[PDB]
Amino acid sequence: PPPPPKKIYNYLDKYVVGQSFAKKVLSVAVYNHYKRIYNNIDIKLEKSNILLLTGSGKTLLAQTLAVPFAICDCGIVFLDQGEGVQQGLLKLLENILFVASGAFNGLDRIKYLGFGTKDRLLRHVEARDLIEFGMIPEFVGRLPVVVPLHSLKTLVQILTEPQYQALFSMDKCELNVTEDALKAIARLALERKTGARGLRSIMEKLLLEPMFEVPNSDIVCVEVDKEVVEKEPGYIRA
Amino acid sequence: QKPPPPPKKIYNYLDKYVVGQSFAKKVLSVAVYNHYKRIYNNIPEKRGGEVLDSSHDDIKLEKSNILLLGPTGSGKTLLAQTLAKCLDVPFAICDCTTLTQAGYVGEDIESVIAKLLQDANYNVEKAQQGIVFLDQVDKIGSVPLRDVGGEGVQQGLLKLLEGTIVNVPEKNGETVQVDTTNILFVASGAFNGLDRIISRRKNEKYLGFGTPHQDIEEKDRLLRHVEARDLIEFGMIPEFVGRLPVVVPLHSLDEKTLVQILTEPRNAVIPQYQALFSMLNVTEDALKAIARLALERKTGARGLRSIMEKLLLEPMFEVPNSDIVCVEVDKEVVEGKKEPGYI
Amino acid sequence: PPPPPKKIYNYLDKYVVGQSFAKKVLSVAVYNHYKRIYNNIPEVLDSSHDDIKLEKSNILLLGPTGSGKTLLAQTLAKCLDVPFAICDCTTLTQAGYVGEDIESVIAKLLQDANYNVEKAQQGIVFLDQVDKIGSVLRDVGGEGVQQGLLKLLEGTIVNVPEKETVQVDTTNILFVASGAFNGLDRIISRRKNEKYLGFGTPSNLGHQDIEEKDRLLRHVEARDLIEFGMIPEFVGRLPVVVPLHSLDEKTLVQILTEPRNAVIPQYQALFSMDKCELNVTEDALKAIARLALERKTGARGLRSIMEKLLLEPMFEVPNSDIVCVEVDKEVVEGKKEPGYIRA
Amino acid sequence: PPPPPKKIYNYLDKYVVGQSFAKKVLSVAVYNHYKRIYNNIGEVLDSSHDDIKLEKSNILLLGPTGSGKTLLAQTLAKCLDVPFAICDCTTLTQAGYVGEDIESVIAKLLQDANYNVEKAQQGIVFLDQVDKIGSVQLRDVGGEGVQQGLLKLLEGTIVNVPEGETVQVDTTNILFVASGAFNGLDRIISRRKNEKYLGFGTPSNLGKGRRASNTHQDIEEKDRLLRHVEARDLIEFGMIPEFVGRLPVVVPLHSLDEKTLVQILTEPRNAVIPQYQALFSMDKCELNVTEDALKAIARLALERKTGARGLRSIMEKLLLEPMFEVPNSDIVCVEVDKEVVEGKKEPGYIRA
Amino acid sequence: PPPPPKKIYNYLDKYVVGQSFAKKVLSVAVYNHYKRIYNNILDSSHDDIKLEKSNILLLGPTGSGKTLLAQTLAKCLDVPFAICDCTTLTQAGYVGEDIESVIAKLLQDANYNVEKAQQGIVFLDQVDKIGSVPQLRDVGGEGVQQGLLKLLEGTIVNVPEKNETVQVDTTNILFVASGAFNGLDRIISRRKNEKYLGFGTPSNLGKGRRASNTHQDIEEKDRLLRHVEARDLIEFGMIPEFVGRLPVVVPLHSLDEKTLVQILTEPRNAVIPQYQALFSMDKCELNVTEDALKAIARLALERKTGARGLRSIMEKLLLEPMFEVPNSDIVCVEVDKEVVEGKKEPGYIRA
Amino acid sequence: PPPPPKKIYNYLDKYVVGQSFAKKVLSVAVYNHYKRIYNNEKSNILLLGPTGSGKTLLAQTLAKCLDVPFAICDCTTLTQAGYVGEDIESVIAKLLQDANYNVEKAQQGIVFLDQVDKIGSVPRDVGGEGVQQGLLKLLEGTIVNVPTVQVDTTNILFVASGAFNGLDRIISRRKNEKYLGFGTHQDIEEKDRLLRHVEARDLIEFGMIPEFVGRLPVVVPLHSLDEKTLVQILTEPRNAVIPQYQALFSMDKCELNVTEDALKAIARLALERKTGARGLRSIMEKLLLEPMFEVPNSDIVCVEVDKEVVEGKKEPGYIRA
Numbered sequence A: 001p002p003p004p005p006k007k008i009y010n011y012l013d014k015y016v017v018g019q020s021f022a023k024k025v026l027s028v029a030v031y032n033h034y035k036r037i038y039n040n041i042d043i044k045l046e047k048s049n050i051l052l053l054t055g056s057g058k059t060l061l062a063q064t065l066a067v068p069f070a071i072c073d074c075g076i077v078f079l080d081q082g083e084g085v086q087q088g089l090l091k092l093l094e095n096i097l098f099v100a101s102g103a104f105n106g107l108d109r110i111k112y113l114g115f116g117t118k119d120r121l122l123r124h125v126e127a128r129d130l131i132e133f134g135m136i137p138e139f140v141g142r143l144p145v146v147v148p149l150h151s152l153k154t155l156v157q158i159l160t161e162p163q164y165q166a167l168f169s170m171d172k173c174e175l176n177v178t179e180d181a182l183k184a185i186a187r188l189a190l191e192r193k194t195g196a197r198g199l200r201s202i203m204e205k206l207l208l209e210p211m212f213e214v215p216n217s218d219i220v221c222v223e224v225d226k227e228v229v230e231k232e233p234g235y236i237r238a
Numbered sequence B: 001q002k003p004p005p006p007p008k009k010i011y012n013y014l015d016k017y018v019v020g021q022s023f024a025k026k027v028l029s030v031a032v033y034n035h036y037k038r039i040y041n042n043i044p045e046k047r048g049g050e051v052l053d054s055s056h057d058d059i060k061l062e063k064s065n066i067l068l069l070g071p072t073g074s075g076k077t078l079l080a081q082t083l084a085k086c087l088d089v090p091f092a093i094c095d096c097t098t099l100t101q102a103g104y105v106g107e108d109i110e111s112v113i114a115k116l117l118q119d120a121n122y123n124v125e126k127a128q129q130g131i132v133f134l135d136q137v138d139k140i141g142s143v144p145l146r147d148v149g150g151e152g153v154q155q156g157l158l159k160l161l162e163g164t165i166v167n168v169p170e171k172n173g174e175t176v177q178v179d180t181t182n183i184l185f186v187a188s189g190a191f192n193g194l195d196r197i198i199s200r201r202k203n204e205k206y207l208g209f210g211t212p213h214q215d216i217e218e219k220d221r222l223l224r225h226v227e228a229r230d231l232i233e234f235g236m237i238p239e240f241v242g243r244l245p246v247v248v249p250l251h252s253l254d255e256k257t258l259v260q261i262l263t264e265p266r267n268a269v270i271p272q273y274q275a276l277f278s279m280l281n282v283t284e285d286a287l288k289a290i291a292r293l294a295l296e297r298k299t300g301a302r303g304l305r306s307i308m309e310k311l312l313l314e315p316m317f318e319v320p321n322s323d324i325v326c327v328e329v330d331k332e333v334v335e336g337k338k339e340p341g342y343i
Numbered sequence C: 001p002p003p004p005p006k007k008i009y010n011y012l013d014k015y016v017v018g019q020s021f022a023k024k025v026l027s028v029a030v031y032n033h034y035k036r037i038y039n040n041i042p043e044v045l046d047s048s049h050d051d052i053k054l055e056k057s058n059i060l061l062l063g064p065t066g067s068g069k070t071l072l073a074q075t076l077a078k079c080l081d082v083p084f085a086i087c088d089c090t091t092l093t094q095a096g097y098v099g100e101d102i103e104s105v106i107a108k109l110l111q112d113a114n115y116n117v118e119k120a121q122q123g124i125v126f127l128d129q130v131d132k133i134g135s136v137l138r139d140v141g142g143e144g145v146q147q148g149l150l151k152l153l154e155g156t157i158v159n160v161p162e163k164e165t166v167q168v169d170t171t172n173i174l175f176v177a178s179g180a181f182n183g184l185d186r187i188i189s190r191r192k193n194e195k196y197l198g199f200g201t202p203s204n205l206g207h208q209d210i211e212e213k214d215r216l217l218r219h220v221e222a223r224d225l226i227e228f229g230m231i232p233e234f235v236g237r238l239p240v241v242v243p244l245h246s247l248d249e250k251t252l253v254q255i256l257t258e259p260r261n262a263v264i265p266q267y268q269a270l271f272s273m274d275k276c277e278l279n280v281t282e283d284a285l286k287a288i289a290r291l292a293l294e295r296k297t298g299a300r301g302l303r304s305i306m307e308k309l310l311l312e313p314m315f316e317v318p319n320s321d322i323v324c325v326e327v328d329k330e331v332v333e334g335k336k337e338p339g340y341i342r343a
Numbered sequence D: 001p002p003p004p005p006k007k008i009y010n011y012l013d014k015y016v017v018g019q020s021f022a023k024k025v026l027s028v029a030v031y032n033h034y035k036r037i038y039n040n041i042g043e044v045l046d047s048s049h050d051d052i053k054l055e056k057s058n059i060l061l062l063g064p065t066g067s068g069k070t071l072l073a074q075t076l077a078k079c080l081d082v083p084f085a086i087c088d089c090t091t092l093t094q095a096g097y098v099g100e101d102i103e104s105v106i107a108k109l110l111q112d113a114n115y116n117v118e119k120a121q122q123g124i125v126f127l128d129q130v131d132k133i134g135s136v137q138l139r140d141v142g143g144e145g146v147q148q149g150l151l152k153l154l155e156g157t158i159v160n161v162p163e164g165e166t167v168q169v170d171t172t173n174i175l176f177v178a179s180g181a182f183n184g185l186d187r188i189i190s191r192r193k194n195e196k197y198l199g200f201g202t203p204s205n206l207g208k209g210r211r212a213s214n215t216h217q218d219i220e221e222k223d224r225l226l227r228h229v230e231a232r233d234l235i236e237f238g239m240i241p242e243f244v245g246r247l248p249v250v251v252p253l254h255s256l257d258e259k260t261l262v263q264i265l266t267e268p269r270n271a272v273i274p275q276y277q278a279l280f281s282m283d284k285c286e287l288n289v290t291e292d293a294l295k296a297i298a299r300l301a302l303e304r305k306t307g308a309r310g311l312r313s314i315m316e317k318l319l320l321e322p323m324f325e326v327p328n329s330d331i332v333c334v335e336v337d338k339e340v341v342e343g344k345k346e347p348g349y350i351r352a
Numbered sequence E: 001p002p003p004p005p006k007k008i009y010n011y012l013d014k015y016v017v018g019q020s021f022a023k024k025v026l027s028v029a030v031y032n033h034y035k036r037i038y039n040n041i042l043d044s045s046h047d048d049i050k051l052e053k054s055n056i057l058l059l060g061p062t063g064s065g066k067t068l069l070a071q072t073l074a075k076c077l078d079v080p081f082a083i084c085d086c087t088t089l090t091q092a093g094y095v096g097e098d099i100e101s102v103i104a105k106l107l108q109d110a111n112y113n114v115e116k117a118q119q120g121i122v123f124l125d126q127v128d129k130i131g132s133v134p135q136l137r138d139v140g141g142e143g144v145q146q147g148l149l150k151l152l153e154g155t156i157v158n159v160p161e162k163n164e165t166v167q168v169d170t171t172n173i174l175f176v177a178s179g180a181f182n183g184l185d186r187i188i189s190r191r192k193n194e195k196y197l198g199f200g201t202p203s204n205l206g207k208g209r210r211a212s213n214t215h216q217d218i219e220e221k222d223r224l225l226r227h228v229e230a231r232d233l234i235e236f237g238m239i240p241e242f243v244g245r246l247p248v249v250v251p252l253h254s255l256d257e258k259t260l261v262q263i264l265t266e267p268r269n270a271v272i273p274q275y276q277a278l279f280s281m282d283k284c285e286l287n288v289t290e291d292a293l294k295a296i297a298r299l300a301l302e303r304k305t306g307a308r309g310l311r312s313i314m315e316k317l318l319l320e321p322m323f324e325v326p327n328s329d330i331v332c333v334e335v336d337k338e339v340v341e342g343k344k345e346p347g348y349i350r351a
Numbered sequence F: 001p002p003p004p005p006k007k008i009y010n011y012l013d014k015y016v017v018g019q020s021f022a023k024k025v026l027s028v029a030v031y032n033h034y035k036r037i038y039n040n041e042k043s044n045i046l047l048l049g050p051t052g053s054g055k056t057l058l059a060q061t062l063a064k065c066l067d068v069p070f071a072i073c074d075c076t077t078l079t080q081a082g083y084v085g086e087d088i089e090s091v092i093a094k095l096l097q098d099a100n101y102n103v104e105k106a107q108q109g110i111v112f113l114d115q116v117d118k119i120g121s122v123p124r125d126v127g128g129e130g131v132q133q134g135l136l137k138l139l140e141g142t143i144v145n146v147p148t149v150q151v152d153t154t155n156i157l158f159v160a161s162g163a164f165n166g167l168d169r170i171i172s173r174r175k176n177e178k179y180l181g182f183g184t185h186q187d188i189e190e191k192d193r194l195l196r197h198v199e200a201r202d203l204i205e206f207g208m209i210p211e212f213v214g215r216l217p218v219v220v221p222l223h224s225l226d227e228k229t230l231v232q233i234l235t236e237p238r239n240a241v242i243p244q245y246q247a248l249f250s251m252d253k254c255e256l257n258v259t260e261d262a263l264k265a266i267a268r269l270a271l272e273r274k275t276g277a278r279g280l281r282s283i284m285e286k287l288l289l290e291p292m293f294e295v296p297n298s299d300i301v302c303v304e305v306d307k308e309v310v311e312g313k314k315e316p317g318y319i320r321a
């Protein structure tokens, strides 16, 4: 049988840093799928399916939840997201557990015109709101649980798999960065609104000139930076 | 083919899924029974000049499409699905807001017969007895330079509702031919503002001094008297209104019925969670609170699964703990003023 | 020989109650078709003469909804020795745009002829909904379709894709168009009622609506179809114009009993399948026809009433001890229940 | 030798009433086509010459509905020693879009030539409904996109006509004859002639000349005005300048007068009334229409504003009751007097 | 050796009247092509210069001599050539001819000698018709321009063999485009602030000061086109990548009446010589007097269809003679200033 | 050993004048490719910028100094699988024909996908978004069957280039706001600033699918060639424009002299027509037309161009034997 959802949540916390709220609901939901199987091994319960409502770790959460762990974009399955295609998927979702990822705008219920005596956007999701976004009502009825994901800040610095130090190490040179300012390098991803995918691009920009000067005919000592993204990059020389 | 179940045996089936709407269930039971009975009664000198001297022929029986009238969330499409599932006939839903006249960017009229044939799993002869639910037909009404959508779609359905050949692409440019001559069409709409047309026709007063019980039953009372004379005035084309000879009024759900929808239907929300092992008690005043909360949220019975799922999230995590023999919900717990009882 | 037009009329007269003029025109037109195709079908030039080739004369049918325009088409087609196609002008578009190609009209006819090309070239094509292609960025579904049909109607070598393409010569194919032409009586009224506007000269300066609707439509002329928005090219090659009249109570009472597939014999059959006899008395027939006029949808009104009256018998009769059901003027007036006679 | 224009004109004159100008143009044009055919059948820059190559002049036929445009084209095509194709421009679309490709015009000409390419390269092509290709955002996939696609064909070019499956047809000597109604062109010519103006325009011409049926006025007004059609008016109608320039010969067919409609009933081959009395021959019945009724029928037909096709609409309307009652009624003859046409009588019957 | 540009010019002069600038550009470009082909056939050193190509665009109005220049130059070329029409083509994956058909047609002319095809000249007619529409998948519009970019600049292309494909490299193939570009004058004038609203200090000319009305429209259109610039073709609907690699641009001018009078008699295949060749078959002589030709050229100029308007006049005048001569005893047809004016019937000299 | 990046940079500087930044990124990325070839992570490259900026010139010159196999491809040829036209896998097939089918070496190659903006989506495409969905299976590693052998793309480095004409306008609608209240060189440099702030969310709006943009982690916008660069391009680079015309004249035994003040005059005229460094050729052909016609087979021995000739105020000078 499956483990209790509290232990599922703990293992999800081993690879997803934030989203403790979403991790809790998903843990409660998927446990209710697999338990019915071990009951089969007043009508029986209908199948349970999830909406995971950019760049977020929602696919990583489903993978950390893992079963075949199959995934796709457009046992268990996972999916992204015309009305013809949604009607066709509705014939298959009726089988194995599935997850639909996505993002949307205007899902709030939407003031007074006279005198009188986001967490706000996505905690109050309604089927009537998902219908207003144009999903087919019968397909919305196939996805009865909607979990909202956290907008990703320390988690950007706290995630793990500055890892480029191995590339300079292959150049016989050290690399380091001032953690007390790395929060400002991570904050550039927050103002770019890249999500977590921006990190790789940002590193390729700041390190470019170091990567041009360090490789040869140059001092092998450690490169260093502090607030350099806010200045010029420093180095020791040897 | 197979013998249709009598209307009362259909009515007792719909009674298991759709709360309260006795009159709609009655009319639909008779209409569906008649439709498949006559198909079973006109089933296969037949052509050419020999017909001129044909001394007699079998009376061909002709179909009677349906119009469902009523507020949103009142079970219109829920009924049509139970109707289909009561007879295993293929069933399709078309959102008429999406259609446009041929030549233009929207979806074409004939795409509905394709998804019927898919629902029939390409068994053409079973696709060709199906039920096609035309949803939101109120929204292709004519507006008061070409009315694509609108009147343009109404005039395009006219020889779909009556029998005509349509070409449908196969499962794989090759196509199969589906003949709509025996498909039952069930239009549906919330004809918003039709009550004003009826009352104005019926010589009832709603303005000025001396206009003058239930809060909204006055609209259900009045919609019951709908007739073709004023579906035309709403903006439906006469050619189109004439092809939908059966009209069915559906009333709005009360909180009295929403409390029944929580327990009573075969797919009710509460029996699902209450079926879990090591488990719920829900106080009857909590059911009333949930019903009022749905109305106050102004979400229909579709909302009941949403509110109840949000209340039971915290028990569902804790409940594997062996000390939880019972989880209890009460009137003030639904109000969020108290934590659920763990005992 | 082909059947004389007085024999074809006697066949149409069995299904269509009114409209003795439209029966007469269609009967002669089919008779002339057979005479033509026998006549018309088995360089440097000088001769004293060549054999006279008979041209064709396409037909246009006009009249209100529920008047019998499609019933005349579907009745005639059963007694044709040549192939036929019935098709809808609302599906077509001009070339290059999404829609049906106009040549599909002939492809459907070639299929009906079982791909015997030399037989398809003798067929008859019924174009329904011809008023919907009237003129109003190209008019891809309107004037663009009218101007594409021009050389189908006069006759050309058409490439038909079937079963590579097949060349079908439409020179001998006869086309019959039909439409309601809503608002053409208004155009005819202007044509003959309007006088001079100003001070003229030194001499002389300074259901009765439905009755007029039919009396005025009888005077339709080519100038009125051109004002309605059919282009002169197209009106010029539909030379035979045929106005159908609306239906009175005197006919609606007659449509209930008299023709083949009459409205009540259909319901008597549905009750006969339940071993039940339905009695509608003569005084009820007048009332059912009286109510059917205020449905404003022609002979389709009759079944909308019958489906409302019989709802209770049709629910209670199946598997019951009832042996006969009796409908009287009081029942039609809505002030009594239908009488049940029991075994 | 090829037949002289006189001989060809005398053939067209047997089927088409009036339009002596269009008959002359078509007769001289095909005579010149034979003369061009029989004549036309490294790099060095000096000391060399070339014999004169004759070049075709494509034709455009303009005119009202029902006036003889397609009749002239069809009765001419029966008199050609050289392959021909007749086709409808409304079927064509720009390359890459659904519909018939513009080179299908040449493919059906090659089929007419039994795939003898060197004979197809001499053919005559009749393009009906050329006004519907008028220009009028979005691609004009049929219309302006078809006009600019035909420029390859109206001048000399090599077409990869499909039966590789493609046979190259050199379209240089192929002669094109276009037809259209150009509905509304006279409204363009009058505005060109300053016959519509605002303000005083005082330098303009004085026009103060010596004082110089209601349907006949409109017919004479339009027919007067088309005779002045020019290239600059086809451009304003929406033909592409490249497209007008390579249709050098413009022929306005005049509208049919009432006096000509009386001839069309009796006089030409396959005339309207000879067809109907031939229909009565199968019923062993005569039809007699009298020379006073003929003028009455032509007068009613002119009011249909639809050319010679109006004559059929009336004949079908008068004879309907005879044609229904005659087939087995021992009727020996049907008599139509002027009073029958005016609706003051039923058609008289002679009983056997 | 290559023929010098004045020799090619003196040949073009025998067929085309009054396009001396385009005759120069084509003559120099053909000379540069041969001259370039003869030449073009860690650090690095001792590599020779490569002589890149300068493709040509011909812009002038309808009936101005664009195709006639192309069709005459194709007789001077001692190297393979292909003439093709841009309205046939569509982008890859859609029905119609591929862009690569342009090079296959060139390879056929070279008898599939790839080395000789690889230095040929390609004439693209009707290049204005692939101009994009003012988003859409323009299968035959902009999508054709995007496909041509890799031909106009040098790339290896696989063309289907006559039988399989063979590679050929467009790097030395010279492309000559032409089009009418109807409406470009309305773009150049709007670029020149000739449609500006309100007051403004800078003024360039004292316009006016002059004084047949159809002659002024011709003079204006010729003036604007003489100032055509890449900024305009990008506004007409050509893409910047496409305009940028047609470096040489050649506005042909419209034809004066002074020129139309010359085109009637002067060239090879001139209009009047080839009409009187038709009467020669009927054993008849057509005489047009020198003051009738001026009257014909006036009437033709008003047609707004260029030199191909001349035969529209000639077909209108001679229709009666051509119908009445061909089996008669008429020996000569005489035309004069009054016959062309329509005051008079053409003179018939009887046997 | 791998060439240091400032060695490659000094090679690129022999051919490309303008973009001292894009030279650095390419030199670093080519070094990293060599350095990732053993003890093996990649980032693919997208070259944005104006027409005639040097995008194809950068790619085509870099391939001259490259040991690893390379392929040059135009995305305008590709189509969805099963339609007529070139198959997307043929991009790798052209690479495998380089280095003579050594699959062990081909897996380390560099692929230059030019004209990637032309497969942009549009608001069933045989090109467009249909082609992009295929390239994902190349940019992310897959074992692709090639005419047969299987080639792993995992270590292939893809470079992309495109003009993205109109992408500046897409950024403009994102980067600025139409506030309302109390609170030529200028047209070109306004774009050079704006295009420098391109972000992945803008390339998605241009019609590149979100996964395809994510597979191109580093975007390199080439700047527009200003007049100070264009004048240098005339004299300075290998195969410089004017040395080509001097060769065309010198084989007529004629010397072409262009004064330094004419060069500055040519460069201004080229800046106006906004077709990049190709504008230089359009003016030189316009200016030199008359002497190229008159000079061959003539006694002229030198042609002199000066700022009055470029300005149209004078005819070209001729000197004769």
Ligand SMILES: Nc1ncnc2c1ncn2[C@@H]1O[C@H](COP(=O)(O)OP(=O)(O)OP(=O)(O)O)[C@@H](O)[C@H]1O
Pocket (backbone or CB within 6 Å): D242, D245, E015, E016, E017, E018, E019, E060, E061, E062, E063, E064, E065, E066, E067, E068, E069, E179, E180, E263, E267, E307, E308
């Ligand atoms: N400058 C000219 N000199 C002599 N004849 C001319 C001249 N221009 C046109 N012609 C005559 O007109 C005919 C058509 O000219 P041409 O094909 O060159 O026009 P074009 O400008 O290419 O037209 P389009 O824009 O329609 O393609 C020539 O064959 C010739 O008879």
Ligand SMILES: Nc1ncnc2c1ncn2[C@@H]1O[C@H](COP(=O)(O)OP(=O)(O)OP(=O)(O)O)[C@@H](O)[C@H]1O
Pocket (backbone or CB within 6 Å): E241, E244, F015, F016, F017, F018, F019, F050, F051, F052, F053, F054, F055, F056, F057, F058, F162, F163, F225, F233, F237, F276, F277, F278
């Ligand atoms: N920065 C430069 N330095 C030197 N020469 C240049 C430069 N930019 C352009 N050129 C010259 O101009 C030509 C056009 O530039 P290039 O080939 O790089 O095209 P591109 O910028 O990629 O444009 P397109 O979008 O048309 O492909 C070059 O091949 C070269 O001859």
Ligand SMILES: Nc1ncnc2c1ncn2[C@@H]1O[C@H](COP(=O)(O)OP(=O)(O)O)[C@@H](O)[C@H]1O
Pocket (backbone or CB within 6 Å): A141, B017, B018, B019, B020, B021, B071, B072, B073, B074, B075, B076, B077, B078, B079, B253, B261, B265, B300, B301, B302
């Ligand atoms: N009378 C009812 N009895 C039981 N369930 C209902 C009833 N009305 C609505 N529902 C619930 O509401 C959902 C939405 O369906 P429905 O109300 O039929 O759509 P519509 O708004 O088109 O009528 C149904 O799936 C069903 O779960």
Ligand SMILES: [Mg+2]
Pocket (backbone or CB within 6 Å): C069, C070, C071
């Ligand atoms: Mg009908």
Ligand SMILES: [Mg+2]
Pocket (backbone or CB within 6 Å): D069, D070, D071
């Ligand atoms: Mg015609």
Ligand SMILES: [Mg+2]
Pocket (backbone or CB within 6 Å): E066, E067, E068
């Ligand atoms: Mg030309």
Ligand SMILES: [Mg+2]
Pocket (backbone or CB within 6 Å): F052, F054, F055, F056, F057
């Ligand atoms: Mg480039």
